[PDB]
Amino acid sequence: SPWRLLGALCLQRPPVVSKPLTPLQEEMASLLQQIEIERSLYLAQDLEDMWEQKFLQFKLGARITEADEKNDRTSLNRKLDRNLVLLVREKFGDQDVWILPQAEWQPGETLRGTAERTLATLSENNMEAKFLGNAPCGHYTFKFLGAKVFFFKALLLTGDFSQAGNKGHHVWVTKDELGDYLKPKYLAQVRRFVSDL
Template structure:
């Protein structure tokens, strides 16, 4: 959760980071007794649907490898049939009685003509969708060659703040279970998503605005978990304008600088 005021302490976690111990019941209980509220957050990703366009260098290398492969490859079955058909036609022209019972044989060239006609009728799906043209960032059907992540708008004091889905930790939960519950609250049930591990991938600490602080509550500590969306859609209970699917380079349009510096270290494009 981003805050308009407060000092930021963040870091991408490793196996040696002491924060990982907080996922245990004793660690969570000790933190819960402190002035810091615990939150579990999920970085929900929609993987790229199509491969990105090749750069000029990649295209040049691909053409070179294809040329080398073609020069060193053996004849395919279809190429062998073309050669045999050519020989058969030459012998038939020289001898009218040759192969007189093979009128129904399908020639390789006939197959090529059929394939060529089908190829002319085939139309590839566009890389740019209607959601791209309308810049509808609430749609999953956009930026098909890029990884998208889910952001939601939440109320922090008197301010609307964009963040990853998150929710407060409850006693008896592991931090991953808290993150799963944060995801389920978006749609009423747990979406089809694969969580990538039991350990947090990032950590963010902030102080509440002064108007929200109490004697027992100073701020919050947020633990981020990664998850990959399996289904092609996520029916969220939030209204349009309260959630977006954005790429990594679009995060800066929504997240506060402190929050952005915390999450961009583990939000990588795949």
């Protein structure tokens, strides 16, 4: 039977900023600090004042660059405390669905080669990605002539995402907007293999 060969890639951007501590974790931090003080085994004022003013003079880099934008979905720095996933709008001849970046593959090209091609096929940038294994993460088959789509996985080491204002609709989705943007069951189940954490 005529089969429509299609692969894909669920790119993963790891969090550059660790998640902020909950008040429960802050209470545990206080408890561990006080037990550490209890278990501890043995002009300072001027030094403390100088060191605290050294702390005060420099402003710490904001852990959240997200509240100011509210519209920069295309920006690579949409979120910092969580993983990000690339997601680009696509328009087919018979369909128009917000679809994870896919690609067409041939039997002369392996799945790893298809993923490596897809790394720069649609973003036209100099992004640096890393692969773990040939094992995929999700498979979804929708027919009209058979077809299949393989959602793979990759991790971003560094990225020179030039011309961020691309003609595409790349919107970085962490966990929540996946259901909002991908309605059909064949595309709303990506969160099963997306690291929700």
